[PDB]
């Protein structure tokens, strides 16, 4: 139960500022070193910063010097990344990690990451539309989650009870500047008269939750 939990990511305008937190449990950051690493969408890992909280010693990647400051509060067992003068190309998932023991040069525990989107576009929640199963085989159905910004959206089916045969596709960026994704599932054709299928869509950035029942279309 060593654990690192990030927070504070979200959408911010170019030139803006944001502060990330990394809350540690099951160990004391006093004992060790904490790092930040980021990953732009579709790209590789880029080392960002590190700190030794006991004496405040810090090192930065050239790409963030002067703009980002890593800090820690050992009395709250939390580290921070204060990010200023943000640009588009700072857009990424930001992870914090540590070294443990006296095992230097090995990031053994990582947080789950928090997304930072640096953009002028406004927040927009999605519309959800059905992908109705058509006319003893297997049938497909799904939900189309259209026109949202920023990422991410999550989708579950029947509140988490339906996970087999579910595919939730990576979002695509449309030329409008908005994202869209679909989630589909295959099910037994004979279940269609009788079993209820609902997709649960959550776009936390616009606080939009939608549960969409998807069924055969009547005719």
């Amino acid at each position: 139960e060593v654990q690192l939990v990030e927070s504070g990511g979200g959408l911010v305008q170019p030139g803006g500022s944001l502060r990330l937190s990394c809350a540690a449990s099951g160990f004391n950051i006093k004992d060790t070193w904490i790092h930040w690493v980021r990953q732009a969408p579709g790209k590789g890992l880029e080392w960002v910063a590190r700190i030794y909280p006991t004496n405040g010693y810090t090192r930065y990647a050239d790409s963030v010097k002067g703009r980002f400051t890593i800090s820690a509060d050992t009395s709250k067992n939390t580290a921070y990344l204060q990010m200023n003068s943000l640009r588009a190309e700072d857009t990424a998932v930001y992870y914090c990690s540590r070294w443990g023991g006296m095992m230097f040069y090995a990031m053994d525990y990582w947080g789950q990451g928090t997304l930072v989107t640096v953009s002028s576009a406004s927040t927009k929640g999605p519309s959800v539309f059905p992908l109705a199963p058509s006319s003893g085989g297997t049938a497909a159905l799904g939900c189309l989650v259209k026109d949202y910004f920023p990422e991410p959206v999550t989708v579950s089916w029947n509140s988490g009870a339906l996970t087999s045969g579910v595919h939730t596709f990576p979002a695509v960026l449309q030329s409008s500047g908005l994202y869209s994704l679909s989630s589909v599932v295959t099910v037994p054709s004979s279940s269609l008269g009788t079993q209820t299928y609902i997709c649960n869509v959550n776009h936390k950035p616009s606080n939009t939750k939608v549960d969409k029942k998807v069924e055969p279309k009547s005719c």
Partner: protein
């Protein structure tokens, strides 16, 4: 300055194969300076996991099929018997320098037996048509290999430039992929035409397969 170059930049290999990935320092470095090379595995939508540290030590809990070694300024990760769950991008990391740097990553995909997609087409919903736009969706489900072609036709006119595709990550249990192709039309265009068709080409199908529907027909 010092950087690591991994190779290959991607590869595919069958379950039970032995895979090796290389990481090479971009310049000569005195033997007196240690790189403490680490290797990480990153699955889709997850934080990286540490596999190997200080060149050849196995991190606690990591399966034994993983091992690392390094001769001079050249380092190797080896997976001795590739499992389907090993689909991931793998990164090396050098600590000659401060900041340390990561290699560019090596994408590993599992080769399995050819599997044809099941193909489904979905018309736009009447709810969406109210809004002024029509999305038509074609789904190719659970196929291997990843390469596939999808062609849209509307009353026999090939559609070009008004569709986008998305592909799932390789499945960690069955090693298949799924793919969606979404055609976007205005409502008025959608209503001027009758036959909507997606034609799929894939190695697992002996010739192209079409699914279609006629607008307004049940």
């Amino acid at each position: 300055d010092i950087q690591m170059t991994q190779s290959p930049s991607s590869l595919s290999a069958s379950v039970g194969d032995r895979v090796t990935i290389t990481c090479r320092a971009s310049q000569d470095i005195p033997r007196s300076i240690s790189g403490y090379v680490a290797w990480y595995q990153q699955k889709p939508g997850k934080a990286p996991k540490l596999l190997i540290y200080w060149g050849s030590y196995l991190y606690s809990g990591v399966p034994s099929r993983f091992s690392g070694s390094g001769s001079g300024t050249d380092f190797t990760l080896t997976i001795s018997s590739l499992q389907p769950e090993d689909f991931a991008t793998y990164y090396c990391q050098q600590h000659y320098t401060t900041p340390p740097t990561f290699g560019q990553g090596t994408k590993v995909e599992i080769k399995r037996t050819v599997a044809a997609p099941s193909v489904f087409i979905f018309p736009p919903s009447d709810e969406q048509l109210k809004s002024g736009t029509a999305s038509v969706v074609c789904l190719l489900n659970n196929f291997y290999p990843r390469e596939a072609k999808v062609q849209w036709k509307v009353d026999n006119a090939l559609q070009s430039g008004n569709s986008q595709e998305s592909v799932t990550e390789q499945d960690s249990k069955d090693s298949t992929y799924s793919l969606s192709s979404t055609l976007t039309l205005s409502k008025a265009d959608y209503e001027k035409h009758k036959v909507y068709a997606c034609e799929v080409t894939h190695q697992g199908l002996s010739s192209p397969v079409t699914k279609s529907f006629n607008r307004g027909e049940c």
